[PDB]
Amino acid sequence: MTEYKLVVVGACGVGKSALTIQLIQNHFVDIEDSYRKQVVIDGETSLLDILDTAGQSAMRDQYMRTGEGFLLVFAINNTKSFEDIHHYREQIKRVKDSEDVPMVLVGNKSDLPSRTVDTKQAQDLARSYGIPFIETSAKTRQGVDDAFYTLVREIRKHK
Numbered sequence: 001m002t003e004y005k006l007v008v009v010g011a012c013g014v015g016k017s018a019l020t021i022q023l024i025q026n027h028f029v030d031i032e033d034s035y036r037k038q039v040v041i042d043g044e045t046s047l048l049d050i051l052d053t054a055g056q057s058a059m060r061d062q063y064m065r066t067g068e069g070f071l072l073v074f075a076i077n078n079t080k081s082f083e084d085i086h087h088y089r090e091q092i093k094r095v096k097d098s099e100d101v102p103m104v105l106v107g108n109k110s111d112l113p114s115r116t117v118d119t120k121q122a123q124d125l126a127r128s129y130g131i132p133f134i135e136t137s138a139k140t141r142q143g144v145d146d147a148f149y150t151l152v153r154e155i156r157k158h159k
């Protein structure tokens with residue numbers, strides 16, 4: 001059976017944990033740093049081993065090296081978190097020592113009316129990196145499966 005090591009990166013408070021909890025435990029409440037569950041994606045059974053991190057040591061650099069795919073998460077009501085995305089992508093590329101690393105850009109908190117990051121901005125950035133962009137809400141579950149499953153699919157095309 002296939003195991004996919006995924007890493008969810010992004011600034012503090014963007015909803016990395018909420019997204020992962022929603023995926024794995026199917027709920028949202030307004031504490032675990034890692035998660036593990038077997039799911040079926042496009043008919044293939046996959047064990048997802050997922051780490052949520054903001055980069056703020058030995059475990060971290062380790063999980064980056066072996067992480068096979070990365071969700072780059074920002075919140076649509078957090079301009080700084082969007083600006084931080086470049087730093088996260090560059091850091092990953094450095095540690096992987098590679099230019100073809102599976103990634104997906106995730107704009108979370110899409111249910112909220114406060115928006116300071118335009119969808120156009122995010123789409124343009126994703127196009128530049130050559131990766132998918134998915135709008136999500138850990139609260140409503142919008143895009144949650146799609147974000148993670150799309151990443152798994154990026155990992156497959158990569159191999």
Ligand SMILES: Nc1nc2c(ncn2[C@@H]2O[C@H](COP(=O)(O)OP(=O)(O)O)[C@@H](O)[C@H]2O)c(=O)[nH]1
Nearest residue numbers: 012013014015016017018029030109137138139
């Ligand atoms: N409204 C809304 N709140 C969210 C969403 N995702 C996370 N949150 C809230 O944002 C806060 C920080 O989320 P958290 O998962 O701890 O962020 P993390 O530091 O990236 O893991 C918490 O109060 C969450 O309930 C979302 O999609 N919508």
